[PDB]
């Protein structure tokens, strides 16, 4: 026997994730990641408060 072996890509697995690789490592614990905008708003009101 050989523990069952034909490869990485034979049904359906890679979107728990997306990616970016990360080789060089050795610097973070609880760093950042961003974006820079927010969520829809104001042209129904009165002349609202």
């Amino acid at each position: 026997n050989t523990l069952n072996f034909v490869r990485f890509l034979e049904l359906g697995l890679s979107v728990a994730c997306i990616c970016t690789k990360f080789p060089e490592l050795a610097y973070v614990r609880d760093g950042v990641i961003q974006f820079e905008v927010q969520q829809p708003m104001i042209a129904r009101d009165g002349p609202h408060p």
């Binding site: 610097y27 973070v28 760093g31 950042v32 990641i33 961003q34 974006f35 820079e36």
Partner: peptide, 21 residues
């Protein structure tokens, strides 16, 4: 202000954040 030849659709570029050295 200079913001006037300015996007007319799905504005398609990049997004900033900060690897803290």
């Amino acid at each position: 202000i200079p913001a006037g030849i300015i996007p007319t659709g799905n504005v398609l570029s990049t997004i900033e954040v900060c690897i803290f050295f």
